[PDB]
Design a protein around this ligand. Structure first.
Ligand code: 9HR
Length: 292
Protein backbone atom coordinates (compact mmCIF):
# COMPACT_ATOMS: atom_id res chain seq x y z
CA UNK A 1 0.00 0.00 0.00
CA UNK A 2 2.58 2.80 0.90
CA UNK A 3 5.14 1.26 -1.58
CA UNK A 4 2.19 1.52 -4.15
CA UNK A 5 2.86 4.67 -6.19
CA UNK A 6 0.10 5.88 -8.52
CA UNK A 7 1.26 7.84 -11.65
CA UNK A 8 -1.47 10.48 -11.18
CA UNK A 9 0.13 11.46 -7.81
CA UNK A 10 3.68 11.69 -9.25
CA UNK A 11 4.30 15.43 -10.06
CA UNK A 12 7.28 16.05 -12.36
CA UNK A 13 9.73 18.64 -10.94
CA UNK A 14 13.03 18.46 -12.92
CA UNK A 15 14.92 16.14 -15.25
CA UNK A 16 17.92 14.64 -13.38
CA UNK A 17 19.56 13.02 -16.37
CA UNK A 18 20.42 9.74 -18.04
CA UNK A 19 20.93 6.33 -16.46
CA UNK A 20 22.30 3.02 -17.79
CA UNK A 21 19.30 2.67 -20.31
CA UNK A 22 16.62 5.31 -19.44
CA UNK A 23 15.93 8.75 -17.96
CA UNK A 24 15.81 9.96 -14.30
CA UNK A 25 13.38 12.70 -13.11
CA UNK A 26 12.98 14.45 -9.76
CA UNK A 27 9.28 14.01 -8.89
CA UNK A 28 7.13 14.93 -5.88
CA UNK A 29 4.86 12.06 -4.83
CA UNK A 30 1.89 14.19 -3.76
CA UNK A 31 -1.31 12.08 -3.13
CA UNK A 32 -2.94 15.02 -1.15
CA UNK A 33 -2.24 17.65 -3.96
CA UNK A 34 -0.96 20.19 -1.32
CA UNK A 35 2.74 20.01 -2.51
CA UNK A 36 3.64 18.33 0.88
CA UNK A 37 4.64 14.99 -0.68
CA UNK A 38 8.07 13.40 -0.70
CA UNK A 39 10.56 14.32 -3.42
CA UNK A 40 11.81 11.08 -5.11
CA UNK A 41 14.14 10.10 -8.07
CA UNK A 42 12.16 8.22 -10.76
CA UNK A 43 13.65 6.04 -13.48
CA UNK A 44 11.54 5.35 -16.54
CA UNK A 45 12.62 3.45 -19.71
CA UNK A 46 13.07 5.58 -22.79
CA UNK A 47 12.74 2.64 -25.29
CA UNK A 48 10.71 -0.23 -23.74
CA UNK A 49 12.12 -3.23 -25.75
CA UNK A 50 11.67 -6.88 -24.54
CA UNK A 51 15.36 -7.15 -23.58
CA UNK A 52 15.37 -3.63 -22.02
CA UNK A 53 12.19 -4.19 -19.94
CA UNK A 54 13.64 -7.52 -18.68
CA UNK A 55 16.94 -5.78 -17.70
CA UNK A 56 15.01 -2.97 -15.96
CA UNK A 57 12.90 -5.54 -14.01
CA UNK A 58 16.15 -7.29 -12.92
CA UNK A 59 17.66 -3.96 -11.80
CA UNK A 60 14.42 -3.25 -9.85
CA UNK A 61 14.63 -6.74 -8.24
CA UNK A 62 18.37 -6.29 -7.42
CA UNK A 63 17.78 -2.85 -5.79
CA UNK A 64 14.87 -4.22 -3.78
CA UNK A 65 17.06 -6.90 -2.32
CA UNK A 66 19.75 -4.38 -1.06
CA UNK A 67 19.60 -2.73 2.40
CA UNK A 68 22.86 -0.93 3.27
CA UNK A 69 23.67 2.66 4.38
CA UNK A 70 25.95 3.00 1.37
CA UNK A 71 23.52 1.69 -1.29
CA UNK A 72 20.85 4.08 -2.68
CA UNK A 73 17.37 3.24 -1.20
CA UNK A 74 14.68 1.59 -3.39
CA UNK A 75 11.24 3.05 -2.51
CA UNK A 76 8.80 1.36 -4.87
CA UNK A 77 7.51 0.83 -8.38
CA UNK A 78 4.78 2.74 -10.24
CA UNK A 79 2.74 0.38 -12.50
CA UNK A 80 -0.07 2.80 -13.37
CA UNK A 81 1.13 2.91 -17.05
CA UNK A 82 0.93 -0.91 -17.44
CA UNK A 83 3.68 -3.57 -16.92
CA UNK A 84 5.37 -2.41 -20.17
CA UNK A 85 5.81 1.15 -18.79
CA UNK A 86 7.28 0.56 -15.27
CA UNK A 87 8.70 3.45 -13.13
CA UNK A 88 11.38 2.79 -10.48
CA UNK A 89 11.09 5.02 -7.39
CA UNK A 90 14.31 5.69 -5.47
CA UNK A 91 15.22 8.04 -2.67
CA UNK A 92 16.32 11.48 -3.84
CA UNK A 93 19.97 12.26 -2.83
CA UNK A 94 20.08 16.09 -2.95
CA UNK A 95 23.84 16.66 -3.38
CA UNK A 96 23.94 14.71 -6.65
CA UNK A 97 26.74 12.56 -8.07
CA UNK A 98 30.09 12.31 -6.30
CA UNK A 99 31.69 13.23 -9.66
CA UNK A 100 29.79 16.58 -9.77
CA UNK A 101 30.11 17.18 -6.00
CA UNK A 102 33.93 16.72 -6.14
CA UNK A 103 34.30 18.70 -9.43
CA UNK A 104 32.40 21.54 -7.73
CA UNK A 105 34.37 21.68 -4.47
CA UNK A 106 37.74 20.32 -5.67
CA UNK A 107 40.53 20.48 -2.98
CA UNK A 108 37.94 21.92 -0.45
CA UNK A 109 37.08 18.19 0.28
CA UNK A 110 40.25 17.06 2.12
CA UNK A 111 42.02 13.61 2.02
CA UNK A 112 40.32 12.62 5.38
CA UNK A 113 36.90 13.24 3.74
CA UNK A 114 37.86 11.42 0.47
CA UNK A 115 38.91 8.36 2.53
CA UNK A 116 35.66 8.49 4.48
CA UNK A 117 33.89 8.28 1.02
CA UNK A 118 36.32 5.53 -0.16
CA UNK A 119 35.58 3.56 3.03
CA UNK A 120 31.80 3.88 2.36
CA UNK A 121 32.12 2.76 -1.30
CA UNK A 122 34.14 -0.35 -0.08
CA UNK A 123 31.49 -1.24 2.55
CA UNK A 124 28.73 -0.83 -0.13
CA UNK A 125 30.65 -2.98 -2.65
CA UNK A 126 31.50 -5.61 0.00
CA UNK A 127 27.81 -6.01 0.98
CA UNK A 128 26.91 -6.13 -2.74
CA UNK A 129 29.39 -9.00 -3.20
CA UNK A 130 27.85 -11.05 -0.31
CA UNK A 131 24.71 -11.23 -2.53
CA UNK A 132 26.90 -12.42 -5.50
CA UNK A 133 26.01 -9.21 -7.44
CA UNK A 134 28.61 -7.67 -9.84
CA UNK A 135 27.89 -3.91 -10.18
CA UNK A 136 29.77 -3.58 -13.55
CA UNK A 137 29.50 0.22 -13.58
CA UNK A 138 31.44 1.46 -10.49
CA UNK A 139 32.44 5.13 -11.38
CA UNK A 140 32.16 8.48 -9.45
CA UNK A 141 29.33 9.38 -11.90
CA UNK A 142 27.29 6.45 -10.44
CA UNK A 143 28.04 7.17 -6.76
CA UNK A 144 25.60 9.54 -5.07
CA UNK A 145 26.13 12.06 -2.27
CA UNK A 146 23.53 12.05 0.56
CA UNK A 147 25.36 14.73 2.57
CA UNK A 148 28.95 15.85 3.32
CA UNK A 149 29.25 12.73 5.60
CA UNK A 150 27.71 9.98 3.45
CA UNK A 151 27.91 8.61 -0.11
CA UNK A 152 25.93 5.73 -1.62
CA UNK A 153 26.43 3.44 -4.66
CA UNK A 154 23.89 4.11 -7.42
CA UNK A 155 23.17 3.08 -11.05
CA UNK A 156 22.61 -0.68 -10.81
CA UNK A 157 21.67 -0.55 -14.49
CA UNK A 158 24.44 -2.97 -15.52
CA UNK A 159 24.41 -5.20 -12.42
CA UNK A 160 24.65 -8.95 -12.99
CA UNK A 161 24.03 -11.89 -10.64
CA UNK A 162 26.71 -14.54 -10.74
CA UNK A 163 25.76 -18.10 -11.90
CA UNK A 164 25.52 -20.45 -8.89
CA UNK A 165 28.38 -22.55 -10.37
CA UNK A 166 30.78 -19.71 -11.47
CA UNK A 167 32.83 -16.83 -10.02
CA UNK A 168 32.38 -14.65 -13.12
CA UNK A 169 29.53 -13.61 -15.42
CA UNK A 170 30.26 -13.62 -19.24
CA UNK A 171 28.35 -10.84 -21.18
CA UNK A 172 27.59 -12.39 -24.65
CA UNK A 173 26.51 -9.23 -26.55
CA UNK A 174 27.64 -6.09 -24.67
CA UNK A 175 25.84 -2.75 -24.91
CA UNK A 176 27.49 0.65 -24.09
CA UNK A 177 30.51 -0.29 -21.90
CA UNK A 178 32.61 2.07 -19.68
CA UNK A 179 35.79 0.51 -21.14
CA UNK A 180 38.11 2.98 -19.33
CA UNK A 181 36.99 1.53 -16.01
CA UNK A 182 37.19 -2.09 -17.27
CA UNK A 183 39.49 -4.88 -16.03
CA UNK A 184 41.66 -6.49 -18.88
CA UNK A 185 39.60 -9.73 -18.74
CA UNK A 186 36.39 -7.66 -19.07
CA UNK A 187 37.82 -5.99 -22.27
CA UNK A 188 39.23 -9.25 -23.68
CA UNK A 189 36.77 -11.99 -22.60
CA UNK A 190 33.76 -9.89 -21.43
CA UNK A 191 34.06 -11.66 -18.03
CA UNK A 192 32.82 -9.74 -14.92
CA UNK A 193 33.44 -10.70 -11.30
CA UNK A 194 33.96 -9.22 -7.84
CA UNK A 195 37.61 -8.88 -8.98
CA UNK A 196 36.63 -6.73 -11.99
CA UNK A 197 34.59 -4.43 -9.68
CA UNK A 198 37.74 -4.17 -7.46
CA UNK A 199 39.67 -3.08 -10.65
CA UNK A 200 36.93 -0.44 -11.25
CA UNK A 201 37.11 0.61 -7.59
CA UNK A 202 40.86 1.39 -8.13
CA UNK A 203 39.75 3.65 -10.95
CA UNK A 204 37.18 5.39 -8.60
CA UNK A 205 39.95 5.95 -6.06
CA UNK A 206 42.03 7.43 -8.93
CA UNK A 207 39.02 9.67 -9.84
CA UNK A 208 38.59 10.86 -6.22
CA UNK A 209 42.29 11.91 -5.81
CA UNK A 210 42.28 13.74 -9.18
CA UNK A 211 39.34 15.87 -7.93
CA UNK A 212 37.77 15.38 -11.44
CA UNK A 213 40.43 17.70 -13.09
CA UNK A 214 39.23 17.72 -16.76
CA UNK A 215 42.51 16.57 -18.49
CA UNK A 216 43.12 13.94 -15.76
CA UNK A 217 39.98 11.75 -16.18
CA UNK A 218 40.62 8.03 -16.97
CA UNK A 219 39.51 8.39 -20.72
CA UNK A 220 41.73 11.44 -21.14
CA UNK A 221 44.76 9.72 -19.64
CA UNK A 222 44.28 6.39 -21.35
CA UNK A 223 43.63 8.09 -24.74
CA UNK A 224 46.83 10.12 -24.29
CA UNK A 225 48.63 6.82 -23.56
CA UNK A 226 47.29 4.85 -26.52
CA UNK A 227 47.30 7.95 -28.79
CA UNK A 228 44.42 10.43 -29.48
CA UNK A 229 44.51 9.12 -33.12
CA UNK A 230 42.85 5.84 -32.01
CA UNK A 231 39.13 5.63 -32.85
CA UNK A 232 36.28 3.16 -32.17
CA UNK A 233 37.17 -0.57 -31.87
CA UNK A 234 40.92 0.32 -32.27
CA UNK A 235 40.69 2.07 -28.84
CA UNK A 236 39.76 -1.28 -27.22
CA UNK A 237 42.53 -3.26 -29.05
CA UNK A 238 45.22 -0.71 -27.95
CA UNK A 239 43.84 -0.34 -24.41
CA UNK A 240 44.06 -4.18 -23.97
CA UNK A 241 47.72 -4.24 -25.17
CA UNK A 242 48.60 -1.22 -22.98
CA UNK A 243 47.12 -2.84 -19.82
CA UNK A 244 48.87 -6.17 -20.65
CA UNK A 245 52.19 -4.19 -20.82
CA UNK A 246 51.58 -2.52 -17.41
CA UNK A 247 50.42 0.85 -18.78
CA UNK A 248 48.43 2.41 -15.93
CA UNK A 249 46.92 5.70 -14.79
CA UNK A 250 49.44 7.93 -13.00
CA UNK A 251 49.56 8.83 -9.35
CA UNK A 252 47.19 11.86 -8.99
CA UNK A 253 48.91 15.18 -8.08
CA UNK A 254 49.29 15.24 -4.30
CA UNK A 255 47.95 11.68 -3.83
CA UNK A 256 49.40 10.08 -0.66
CA UNK A 257 51.62 7.13 -1.77
CA UNK A 258 49.69 4.81 0.63
CA UNK A 259 46.51 5.46 -1.41
CA UNK A 260 48.26 5.06 -4.78
CA UNK A 261 49.55 1.64 -3.53
CA UNK A 262 45.91 0.49 -3.12
CA UNK A 263 44.96 1.75 -6.68
CA UNK A 264 47.91 -0.19 -8.26
CA UNK A 265 46.96 -3.32 -6.18
CA UNK A 266 43.45 -3.12 -7.60
CA UNK A 267 44.87 -2.78 -11.09
CA UNK A 268 46.55 -6.19 -11.02
CA UNK A 269 46.43 -8.16 -14.30
CA UNK A 270 46.19 -11.36 -12.18
CA UNK A 271 42.51 -11.57 -11.13
CA UNK A 272 43.34 -13.65 -8.04
CA UNK A 273 45.96 -11.12 -6.81
CA UNK A 274 43.46 -8.25 -6.41
CA UNK A 275 42.47 -7.21 -2.85
CA UNK A 276 39.04 -8.10 -1.47
CA UNK A 277 36.59 -5.31 -0.59
CA UNK A 278 36.64 -6.64 3.02
CA UNK A 279 40.45 -6.03 3.17
CA UNK A 280 40.21 -2.71 1.28
CA UNK A 281 37.70 -1.40 3.86
CA UNK A 282 39.93 -2.51 6.73
CA UNK A 283 43.00 -0.87 5.09
CA UNK A 284 41.30 2.47 4.24
CA UNK A 285 39.91 2.61 7.83
CA UNK A 286 43.41 2.05 9.26
CA UNK A 287 44.74 4.85 6.96
CA UNK A 288 41.97 7.22 8.22
CA UNK A 289 42.87 6.26 11.84
CA UNK A 290 46.59 7.05 11.16
CA UNK A 291 45.48 10.47 9.78
CA UNK A 292 43.00 11.56 12.53
C1 9HR B 1 16.33 6.24 -10.61
C2 9HR B 1 17.75 5.99 -11.32
C3 9HR B 1 18.64 5.16 -10.42
C4 9HR B 1 18.69 3.78 -10.62
C5 9HR B 1 19.48 2.97 -9.83
O1 9HR B 1 19.53 1.63 -10.03
C6 9HR B 1 20.22 3.57 -8.84
F1 9HR B 1 20.99 2.75 -8.09
C7 9HR B 1 20.21 4.93 -8.60
C8 9HR B 1 19.41 5.74 -9.40
C9 9HR B 1 19.37 7.22 -9.17
C10 9HR B 1 19.90 8.05 -10.15
C11 9HR B 1 20.11 9.40 -9.94
N1 9HR B 1 20.79 10.24 -10.84
C12 9HR B 1 21.59 9.86 -12.00
C13 9HR B 1 21.17 10.67 -13.22
C14 9HR B 1 23.12 10.12 -11.73
O2 9HR B 1 23.80 8.88 -11.50
C15 9HR B 1 19.73 9.97 -8.69
N2 9HR B 1 19.95 11.30 -8.52
C16 9HR B 1 19.63 11.78 -7.31
N3 9HR B 1 19.89 13.08 -7.09
C17 9HR B 1 20.45 13.91 -8.14
C18 9HR B 1 20.50 15.36 -7.74
C19 9HR B 1 21.33 16.11 -8.75
C20 9HR B 1 21.21 17.61 -8.66
C21 9HR B 1 22.02 18.22 -7.54
N4 9HR B 1 22.30 19.65 -7.73
C22 9HR B 1 21.19 20.46 -7.20
C23 9HR B 1 23.56 20.01 -7.08
N5 9HR B 1 19.13 11.10 -6.27
C24 9HR B 1 18.94 9.81 -6.46
C25 9HR B 1 19.19 9.13 -7.68
C26 9HR B 1 19.00 7.76 -7.96
Amino acid sequence: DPTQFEERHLKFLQQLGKGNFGSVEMCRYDPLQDNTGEVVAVKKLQHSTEEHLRDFEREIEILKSLQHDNIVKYKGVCYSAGRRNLKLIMEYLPYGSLRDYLQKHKERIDHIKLLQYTSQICKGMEYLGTKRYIHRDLATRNILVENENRVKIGDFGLTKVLPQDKEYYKVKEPGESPIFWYAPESLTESKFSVASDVWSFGVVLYELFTYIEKSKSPPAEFMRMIGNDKQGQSIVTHLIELLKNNGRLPRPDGCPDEIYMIMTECWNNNVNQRPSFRDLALRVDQIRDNMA
